[PDB]
Amino acid sequence: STGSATTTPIDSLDDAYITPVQIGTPAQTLNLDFDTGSSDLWVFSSETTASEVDGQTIYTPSKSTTAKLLSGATWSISYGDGSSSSGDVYTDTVSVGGLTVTGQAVESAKKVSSSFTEDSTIDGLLGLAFSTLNTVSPTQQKTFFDNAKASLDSPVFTADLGYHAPGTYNFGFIDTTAYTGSITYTAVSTKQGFWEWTSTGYAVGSGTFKSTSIDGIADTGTTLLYLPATVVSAYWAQVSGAKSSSSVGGYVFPCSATLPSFTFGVGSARIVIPGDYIDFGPISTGSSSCFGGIQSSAGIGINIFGDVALKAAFVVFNGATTPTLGFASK
The structural domains of the chain, ordered by start, are 5-174 (2.40.70.10), 175-330 (2.40.70.10)
CB-side neighbour CA atoms (13 Å) of 177: 1
Alpha-carbon distance of 171 to 148, in angstroms, equals 9
Q: How far is CA 114 from the centre of its chain?
A: 20
Alpha-carbon distance of 330 to 84, in angstroms, equals 34
The residues near 176 (Cβ < 8 Å, ≥ 6 apart) are none
What is the torsional sign of CA 119, 123, 129, 135?
positive
Does 274 sit behind a cis peptide bond, omega within 30 degrees of 0 on the bond before it? no
CB-side neighbour CA atoms (13 Å) of 108: 23
Burial (Cβ within 10 Å: 0-12, 13-18, ≥19) of residue 286: exposed
Q: CA angle 6-38-231, nearest 5°? A: 90
Residues belonging to the active site: 35, 199
Alpha-carbon distance of 330 to 315, in angstroms, equals 10
Q: Report yes or no: 96 and 3 within 8 Å, Cβ to Cβ.
A: yes
Alpha-carbon distance of 31 to 58, in angstroms, equals 10
Nearest Cα to Cα of residue 90 among 123, 41, 148: 41
Alpha-carbon distance of 16 to 8, in angstroms, equals 8
Q: Report yes or no: 242 and 278 within 8 Å, Cβ to Cβ.
A: no
SS (H, E, C) the chain: CCEEEEEEECCCCCCCEEEEEEECCCCEEEEEEEECCCCCEEECECCCCHHHCCCCCCECHHHCCCCEEEEEEEEEEECCCCCEEEEEEEEEEEEECCEEEEEEEEEEEEEECHHHHHCCCCCEEEECCCHHHCCCECCCCCCHHHHHHCCCCCCEEEEECCCCCCEEEEECCCCCCCCCCCCEEEECECCCCCCEEEEEEEEECCCCCEEEEEEEEECCCCCCEEECHHHHHHHHCCCCCCEEECCCCEEEEECCCCCCCEEEEECCEEEEECHHHHEEEECCCCCCEEEECEEECCCCCCEEECHHHHCCCEEEEECCCCCEEEEECC
Sheet holding 279-282, edge to edge: 243-245, 250-254, 289-292, 279-282
Method: X-ray
Nearest Cα to Cα of residue 46 among 88, 90, 109, 105: 109
Q: CA angle 226-234-306, nearest 5°? A: 15
Alpha-carbon distance of 119 to 109, in angstroms, equals 15
Does 61 sit behind a cis peptide bond, omega within 30 degrees of 0 on the bond before it? no
Nearest Cα to Cα of residue 169 among 131, 106, 220, 214: 220
The residues near 80 (Cβ < 8 Å, ≥ 6 apart) are 37, 222, 300, 304
Residue 231, number of CB atoms within 10 A of its CB: 22
Entry resolution (Å): 1.2
